[PDB]
Every structure is written in C-alpha cells, then in structure tokens.
Design a protein around this ligand. Structure first.
Ligand SMILES: Cc1cncn1Cc1ccccc1
Ligand SMILES: [Zn+2]
Length: 323
C-alpha cells in the first residue's frame, strides 16, 4: 500500500547552532507564561466541572490570538465512569491538518477529582497545569517560525481530558480522553482520501509532558525506539548549559539522565504505544514530592526548572521541524 508511515523512522533533526540557541533562549518569557498561560489554569478542573469548561476556553483563546493558523477541534465524547456516564472534551490544535505527518506535543488538562480536604482544593500544578502552560508558551514563543509552515510534517497539540481516575486507577477508570482519541485516530483515514493509512500512523512522535514543575526532575529514557530523540534532549540540555543559557542549573543535576527505566508508567500514551506510535514520555521518576497532594500548587513550583525546560523543549521542536 503506502509506506509513508515509515518516514518517521528515518527522520533526522536539523541541529541548531549557537547563535540560534541564544535566540530561542531569549525568545521565551517564563514570567509571561506564568501570568497569561499558567495562572488561569490553577483551578479545580476535573471533567464536567465549571473549571473544566473555563480551562478549555482559556486554552482555545490563548491559541487563537496567535498568527500561525491553528485549527482547533473539540473532540467531545461520552464514556462510562464509576459515577455513571459523563461527558469529556479533548482539545486538539493543529497546524496543516492536511499534511501526512505531524509531531505531537501533549498533556492532560483535567485535574484529579477530589472533594475539599481541610478546606483545600486540588489544582494539580504539575499535573498538569504547568505542562499545559509550557505548550501554550512554546506556541507563542515560536509563533513566527511556525507561521512559516503556511518533508510533509507539521506540529499538533493535544490537551487530553479525563487522564485521571475518578475513583480508583484502573483500565476502565483512567485515560478516558486518550483511550478515545487513540481509537478514533486509528480508524480515521489519513491523509484525506487515503485507503490504507490512518491519523495514528501520521503521528510522527508523541511527546507527552506530565508531572513537570518540581525542582530537580530526573527524566528516564523509557523506550528503546525513541531513545535517539531522548539523546537530542540530553545534547540540547548540555549545550544550553555550556552556553550559559540555563539558570540555577548544574550538569551534576541534569534533567535528562543517562539511565533507562525498564518499565512503564501508565499515562495518556499507553493507547498510542500499544498501536505502535513512538513516544517520548517526558515524565520524571521519582514523581514530585507533592504528587496528588493538596501541595501540588503554585508555591511549590520551581520557576527556574520550567524556564530551562521550556528552552530545551522549544529547541527540540524547531530541530524536529527543521525550523
Ligand atoms: C502519570 C499520572 C499522573 N497522574 C496520575 N498518573 C497515573 C499513575 C501512574 C502511576 C501510579 C499512579 C498513577
Ligand atoms: Zn495525577
């Protein structure tokens, strides 16, 4: 049939030079991210809540003000939960929806459901309000360079709804939005008119951000087949450090360690991984100390660590896109 689905296997980056790295490092404002992209999301936003619709409106609005031609679809669906049927809505933002291949950035925008505890409200700053904000910032910071898109490859953002369990993590109570969107893409022909290939095939690489925002994260390399792209993240961290472009950062405590994890951490990528999508899982091990506590808030975030990772990520995306 069609073998384009193999191009991602042979795709190679266009490594940036020191002058361009500097540019990128200069091009991203951590403090504008914090005010315009991050703070509006630090609300209770479990699926079906008022905050979910708010968070959903804020993500679409911030994406809309940008010059690049983002197409936004709200993939709304119904699914059974421990509390009955409920409605969920994934946010999908795509440049050039026609192109066969797309590099995918994503995270979950729901917050785990938890009634008030000690009069406190769970807002999951690292899980995953910050990954959401890093995605919005990457799109703003790279707006002009992405506008250049009008190799048949472009960029897609996915903000999954319903990553978290409502009552008890299990295969039927978890990954609502990603289980839905992976099965939908696996059976939607791509590109338009194709007779043998799916959108799931068009996913060049799924870069899943989760649990980012704490100090000193250590990201393992999880998969033998995306290991080379993990190595680019290592390389980019190193060079930005040597060029004085990172803050409060030591090579003794670098983010992208040279160690592998022999297993898997259940997350929104599992539905795509099982169907053969390559994944770069940017989740740290161990998890933040504030994981699933009421302390996973704004005050326990580390501003420098997010700034640094924004720069590493933005470099990675431009190098993947040859921009
Ligand atoms: C990655 C994540 C973020 N929030 C929940 N998960 C899922 C999970 C993974 C391992 C153990 C418990 C729960
Ligand atoms: Zn969680």
């Amino acid at each position: 049939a069609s073998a384009w689905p193999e191009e991602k296997n042979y795709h190679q980056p266009a490594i940036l030079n020191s002058s361009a790295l500097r540019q990128i490092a200069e091009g991203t404002s951590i403090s504008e991210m914090w005010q315009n992209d991050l703070q509006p999301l630090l609300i209770e936003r479990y699926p079906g809540s008022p905050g979910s619709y708010a968070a959903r409106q804020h993500i679409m609005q911030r994406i809309q003000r940008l010059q690049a031609d983002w197409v936004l679809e709200i993939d709304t669906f119904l699914s059974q939960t421990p509390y009955g049927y409920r409605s969920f809505s994934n946010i999908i933002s795509t440049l050039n929806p026609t192109a066969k291949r797309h590099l995918v950035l994503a995270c979950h925008y729901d917050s785990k459901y938890f009634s008030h505890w000690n009069n406190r409200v769970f807002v999951g700053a690292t899980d995953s309000a910050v990954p959401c904000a890093m995605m919005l910032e990457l799109a703003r910071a790279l707006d002009k360079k992405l506008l250049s898109l009008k190799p048949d490859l472009s960029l897609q953002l996915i903000f999954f709804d319903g990553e978290e369990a409502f009552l008890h993590w299990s295969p039927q109570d978890s990954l609502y939005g990603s289980r839905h969107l992976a099965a939908k893409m696996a059976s939607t022909p791509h590109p338009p008119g194709a007779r043998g290939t799916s959108q799931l095939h068009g996913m060049d690489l799924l870069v899943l951000l989760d649990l980012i925002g704490a100090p000193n994260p250590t990201f393992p390399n999880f998969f033998p087949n995306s290991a080379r792209w993990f190595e680019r993240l290592q390389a980019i961290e190193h060079e930005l450090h040597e060029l004085g472009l990172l803050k409060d950062h030591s090579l003794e405590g670098r983010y992208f360690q040279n160690y592998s994890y022999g297993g898997v951490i259940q997350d929104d990528h599992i539905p795509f991984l099982r169907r053969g999508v390559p994944v770069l899982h940017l989740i740290p091990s161990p998890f933040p100390e504030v994981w699933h506590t009421m302390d996973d808030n704004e005050e326990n975030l580390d501003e420098s660590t997010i700034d640094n990772l924004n720069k590493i990520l933005q470099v990675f995306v431009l190098e993947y896109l040859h921009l």
